[PDB]
Paper text:
Mutations in the ACE2 receptor binding site on the surface S protein have been shown to disrupt antibody binding and prevent viral neutralization. The protective mechanisms for the coronavirus disease 2019 (COVID-19) vaccines are still being deduced, however, several analyses have found that the elicitation of neutralizing antibodies (nAbs) correlates with protection (Feng et al., 2021; McMahan et al., 2021), a finding consistent with many other successful antiviral vaccines. nAbs have been identified that target several distinct epitopes on the S trimer, but the majority of nAbs target the receptor binding domain (RBD) (Barnes et al., 2020; Piccoli et al., 2020). In each complex, we used a stabilized, uncleaved Spike trimer (HPM7) based on the Wuhan strain containing 6 proline (hexaproline or HP) mutations (Hsieh et al., 2020) and an engineered interprotomer disulfide (mut7 or M7) between residues 705 and 883 of the S2 subunit.
Although modeling suggests that CC6.33 should be able to bind an up RBD, we did not observe this in our dataset, possibly because of the HPM7 spike design preferentially displaying 3 down-RBDs.
Residue numbers in the entry:
A (entry chain B), I (entry chain A): 740 to 788
B (entry chain B): 838 to 887
C (entry chain C): 297 to 618, 632 to 676, 689 to 690
D (entry chain A): 14 to 70, 76 to 247, 254 to 296
E (entry chain A): 937 to 1034
F (entry chain A): 543 to 618, 632 to 676, 689 to 690
G (entry chain B): 986 to 1034
H (entry chain A): 346 to 394
Write the structure that this text describes.
């Protein structure tokens, strides 16, 4: 979406290095996971309510 | 339909979404966080550190 | 010295530096081409009595021959010659797969249209090349062959069409073209046209109107079994050594060994995860060979400061030492989990660590040091 | 020269599902023990396949003109060599060139000519009760073939023309594409034992031939053979075929230890 | 408990797995074209003369350098996280064990 | 439009172009409005694709049932690939393919905004 | 096509750099957030409980 | 007649259809080169000054 | 090795920016050193065995 904007010709060229996009998202996903983890470590210390 | 209607608005959030940029929701909601906080305060006042 | 160059210094302090990798050089080259003895039909393609009309261009398959272009040097002269997917100077080192020669006659001012990306009556209605074109376009003046005093009207081109041609499409129909609102059931007048016109080729026409013979050679390179090869001399096949090689035009450096890979009948090359050739089918004996890179690495240097001495020890990380893929020996060979260390004396006494090597082993410079 | 066949019944077209059929080796490179991503035209997984019949019973002898679109997946389930070949072209008459690929039971003939095709083309075999023989007797297909630009004829062979009883035993699959002047054919032959529609399973088709044809193909027609003892004096035999269409797709292909494609994922089928 | 629940050691297994993935990624990335006609230097050199080959090679070199730079940057970030864990462990050794 | 190609959704616009202006552009310098060549009406152009999709998966070694979350769909012609009932709306999006349960449980596969999912019993 | 491809490859490479820069900065910032979250968790245990 | 090169002519073209095919049954050009646009795209475009 | 694969022509071109490779390795070497340091700080606290 960011790079090609639904242009078909661009999408087909982008595929020449598609392993790059996968890697960028692995990195962002890892960040998203930590953000939920950080919240639980600070607040959910006691599971007895 | 909100981004399609409000074009004149030039809403930055729609501009980001149309270019593939998405913000994801937190797993814990503000209500849930408040409940954890309340439990810790109730615990402290009633039983201290025990 | 490699450490000194890396650090841009004539002085190296104490410690361990990584120093490139162990490498070996090739010692000989191997050239393996299919054993083709026939010369390609250059005479038939370039010395033909007649060429086709551009609207109905000819196409011939070329196979099982040697592409020795020098045979044209004592006969032909080409005003136009251009290759698209390959450099001209590399043609003699290559093999070609599906080779076809397209052939036709056009005017001099139309020669420029026989190229990828062009427009005009030839490019749009008679003959079109793909944008992704691998091949060579050859053309020459034929005013003394294809021209007649009263006009040579045997060569036709299409002038009228409703839509453009696709690459390598031929259209030899003669249906009447409708330019207007009239159905043109025959008629052939008013806004109805016969689609083809002749070229009035005469010996006195100016150059732009003289006939030109055009030959287009279409081909593919390095991905499939080849039948047409340049004039190279095959050598013997050398196995289990670091060699340079050329297999049907594909070059590289490596170690060739027998393989257990079973290629399908149409497969000539194999590739690894990085899409790099790692196997070939030999062109004369249909044996599959695997290709292993010559250089495998693992080298670092243990250095006392250079302001003290110039003795160094070299660690070979991937050498067992129990013809070792080392630069030298000279005794003082100690084997550890971190590699084969050459140039240091093993001592049975434990000491505090100074220069760490790895896996529990350290080194130092000590006493006649 | 041409015969208009009659005495056929009227049925709606049947449909089946393609499952995981229609994959072909996209390249001529040996690969093994690896997953590879490619983007050629493919039959989409679980797509709509039109099912045509040649049955005697509700007599049918389905040989319609179908669109070619961007390429065709063709498959046949046979017991007795009924499907002989195909016609590819646009108007299918002597105005334009067209491609004829036919197995005539003695040879295989490929021609590109300005053919004037029959409006109900067929081939056929006559059964001689006397001495129990099956022989070629008819070849219709076209009334003319002018200005031929391409021709190939195979070496001679003898086809088994015997009519058979039992289930279908031979599955033949083809892929037809028309790119930059080449008519590209891929194929596979798989033994079967079935009584209805296209069987489930996976097999990748190998390249067969790249034909230097140079023509515009928008429609095609399947050529079937008849059996005899005339527009009404005929037997439909038994055979069926399937037609699907290719679309640009991204596929994940799995190569096994010996470089055979054994599985695949259609990346556009669903979110999983 | 440790025998029964294999996920207990996921924290150490993850370190091993992340580094292995990063190196396998660098090898897989060699197949990328980066705007070049081919990802293989030998195809470029077998078909093109020096001045043409140089263009195609420079496209691959630039791309290959980016792959290595990306790797190094990610290793530095991960290493910082490991350092923090190691410092925590060292503190615990001093305060919990000794 | 006058040689400029693209893909999108055309709607009436309230933008007032000066007499010499034919095209308008956004912050990314991408055309987002045109003046129609025959009727001099200004049209706005909105991209066709707007996003928000993720898939909730039990392991594939157990089952091939999945649930799909549409982050930007309200569900209350929904810009979804399919429905098939089992449609639950939450703050994290419209979740299609999962049964809502009134019992609280410990979290297994987190979805977001307080909602988790799991594969449970005829599972 | 063959001319457009050159111009498109220039844009694709640049667009990839923009995304890579973004991801790298988010990873660095996330590390700083993680440290803050760990501090907060320590304070919850030692100041609150 | 054409102008002398030292005093070259210039004419404005407007309000018309650029159908180049009309030259196919008359003109023959030895030179033809486009700089900011590909020749094959000319028929899909509109031109200003 | 990674970039050129023993191709001589590539190696000679790579030299146009060889300071880059040196910098990448300085960074990786620094990481390797820390990994041995981290191990000693956690375990080798007492040198009395
Ligand atoms: C291939 O054949 C088709 C069918 O004859 C051609 O498409 C026709 O083109 C004319 C002229 O533009 C239109 O009036 C018809 O309506 C089109 N028919 C269909 C079914 O689309 C097509 O142009 C031919 N291909 C080439 C390269 O000439
Ligand atoms: C063409 O014929 C002439 C003799 O008329 C001969 O000398 C020349 O070599 C021939 N050209 C080729 C390509 O064989
Ligand atoms: C096509 O057939 C006509 C006769 O109908 C003939 O005059 C012409 O030469 C043939 N060939 C071509 C390429 O037009
Ligand atoms: C000639 O080619 C055949 C077939 O590939 C091969 O078996 C034979 O060894 C080759 N010839 C030599 C060395 O003469
Ligand atoms: C070297 O090879 C010997 C066998 O000859 C083996 O016992 C030894 O462990 C190997 N050395 C290392 C460091 O692995
Ligand atoms: C069959 O009928 C069609 C009209 O439906 C006609 O065009 C065709 O030429 C006929 N063929 C024969 C052999 O009678
Ligand atoms: C396509 O497949 C569906 C089943 O998924 C079937 O109902 C339908 O009749 C088939 N063909 C057509 C043309 O609708
Ligand atoms: C098959 O075609 C070939 C070539 O046209 C011909 O010689 C042969 O007689 C044909 N066979 C039959 C049975 O028609
Ligand atoms: C069987 O008899 C028919 C009729 O006399 C004859 O045409 C046919 O050739 C015979 N069969 C064989 C195998 O010769
Ligand atoms: C590969 O081929 C060998 C025979 O050479 C066979 O034993 C083995 O089972 C085959 N492997 C696979 C995955 O089919
Ligand atoms: C012709 O152009 C005028 C002015 O732009 C416009 O108002 C009119 O609708 C156009 N014509 C049609 C559809 O005939
Ligand atoms: C969906 O729309 C309704 C109004 O129809 C609104 O009340 C509800 O809050 C919206 N859902 C979400 C998750 O915002």
């Amino acid at each position: 979406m960011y790079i090609c904007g639904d242009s078909t010709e661009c999408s087909n060229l982008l595929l020449q290095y598609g392993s790059f996009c996968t890697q960028l998202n692995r990195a962002l996903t890892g960040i998203a996971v930590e953000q939920d983890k950080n919240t639980q470590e600070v607040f959910a210390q006691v599971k007895q309510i | 339909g909100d981004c399609l209607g409000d074009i004149a608005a030039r809403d930055l959030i729609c501009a980001q979404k149309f270019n593939g940029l998405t913000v994801l929701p937190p797993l814990l909601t503000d209500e849930m966080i408040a409940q954890y906080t309340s439990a810790l305060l109730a615990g402290t006042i009633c039983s201290g550190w025990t | 010295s490699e450490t000194k160059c890396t650090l841009k210094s004539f002085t190296v302090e104490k410690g361990i530096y990584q120093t490139s990798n162990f490498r070996v050089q090739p010692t000989e080259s191997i050239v393996r081409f299919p054993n083709i003895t026939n010369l390609c039909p250059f005479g038939e393609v370039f010395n033909a009595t007649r060429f086709a009309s551009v609207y109905a261009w000819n196409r011939k398959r070329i196979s099982n021959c040697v592409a020795d272009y020098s045979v044209l040097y004592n006969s032909a002269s080409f005003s136009t010659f251009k290759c698209y997917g390959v450099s001209p100077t590399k043609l003699n080192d290559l093999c070609f797969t599906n080779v076809y020669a397209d052939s036709f006659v056009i005017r001099g001012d139309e020669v420029r249209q026989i190229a990828p990306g062009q427009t005009g009556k030839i490019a749009d209605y008679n003959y079109k090349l793909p944008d992704d074109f691998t091949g060579c376009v050859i053309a020459w003046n034929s005013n003394n062959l294809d021209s007649k005093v009263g006009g040579n009207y045997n060569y036709l081109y299409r002038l009228f069409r409703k839509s453009n041609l696709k690459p390598f499409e031929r259209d030899i129909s003669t249906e009447i073209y409708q330019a207007g609102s009239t159905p043109c059931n025959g008629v052939e007048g008013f806004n109805c046209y016969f689609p083809l016109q002749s070229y009035g080729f005469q010996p006195t026409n100016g150059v732009g109107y003289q006939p030109y013979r055009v030959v287009v050679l279409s081909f593919e390179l390095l991905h499939a079994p080849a039948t047409v090869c340049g004039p190279k001399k095959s050598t013997n096949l050398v196995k289990n050594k670091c060699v340079n090689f050329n297999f049907n035009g594909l070059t590289g450096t490596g170690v060739l060994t027998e393989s257990n890979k079973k290629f399908l009948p149409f497969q000539q090359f194999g590739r690894d995860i990085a899409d790099t050739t790692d196997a070939v089918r030999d062109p004369q004996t249909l044996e599959i060979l695997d290709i292993t890179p010559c250089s495998f690495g693992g080298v670092s240097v243990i250095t006392p400061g250079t302001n003290t001495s110039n003795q160094v020890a070299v660690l070979y990380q991937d050498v067992n030492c129990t013809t070792w893929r080392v630069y030298s020996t000279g005794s003082n060979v100690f084997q550890t989990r971190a590699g084969c260390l050459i140039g240091a004396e093993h001592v049975n006494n434990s000491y505090e660590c100074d220069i760490p090597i790895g896996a529990g082993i350290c080194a130092s410079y000590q006493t006649s040091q | 020269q041409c015969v208009n066949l009659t005495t056929r019944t009227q049925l709606p077209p049947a449909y089946t599902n393609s499952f995981t059929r229609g994959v072909y080796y996209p390249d001529k490179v040996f690969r093994s023990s690896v997953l590879h991503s490619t983007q050629d035209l493919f039959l989409p997984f679980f797509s709509n396949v039109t099912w045509f019949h040649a049955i005697h019973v509700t007599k049918r002898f389905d040989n319609p003109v179908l669109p070619f679109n961007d390429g065709v997946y063709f498959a046949s389930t046979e017991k007795s060599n009924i499907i002989r070949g195909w016609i590819f072209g646009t108007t299918l008459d002597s105005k334009t060139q067209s491609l004829l690929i036919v197995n005539n039971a003695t040879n295989v003939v490929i021609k590109v000519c300005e053919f004037q095709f029959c409006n109900d083309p067929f081939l056929g075999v006559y059964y001689h009760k006397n001495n129990k023989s099956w022989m070629e007797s008819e070849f219709r297909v076209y009334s003319s073939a002018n200005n031929c630009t391409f021709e190939y004829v195979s070496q001679p062979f003898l086809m088994d023309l015997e009519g058979k009883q039992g289930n279908f035993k031979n599955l033949r699959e083809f892929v037809f594409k028309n790119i930059d002047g080449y008519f590209k054919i891929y194929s596979k032959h798989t033994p079967i034992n079935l009584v209805r529609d296209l069987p489930q399973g996976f097999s990748a088709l190998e390249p067969l031939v790249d034909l230097p044809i140079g023509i515009n193909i928008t429609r095609f027609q399947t050529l079937l053979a008849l059996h005899r003892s005339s527009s009404s004096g005929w037997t439909a035999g038994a055979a069926a075929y399937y037609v699907g269409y290719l679309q640009p797709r991204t596929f994940l292909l799995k190569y096994n230890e010996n470089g055979t494609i054994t599985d695949a994922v259609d990346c556009a089928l669903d979110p999983l | 408990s440790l025998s029964s629940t294999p996920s207990a050691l996921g924290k150490l297994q993850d370190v091993v797995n992340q580094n292995a993935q990063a190196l396998n990624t660098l090898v897989k990335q060699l197949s990328s074209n980066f705007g070049a006609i081919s990802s293989v230097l030998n195809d470029i050199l077998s078909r093109l003369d020096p001045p043409e080959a140089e263009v195609q090679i420079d496209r691959l070199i630039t791309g290959r350098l980016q792959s290595l730079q990306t790797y190094v940057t990610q290793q530095l970030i991960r290493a910082a996280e490991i350092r923090a864990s190691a410092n925590l462990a060292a503190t615990k050794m001093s305060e919990c064990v000794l």
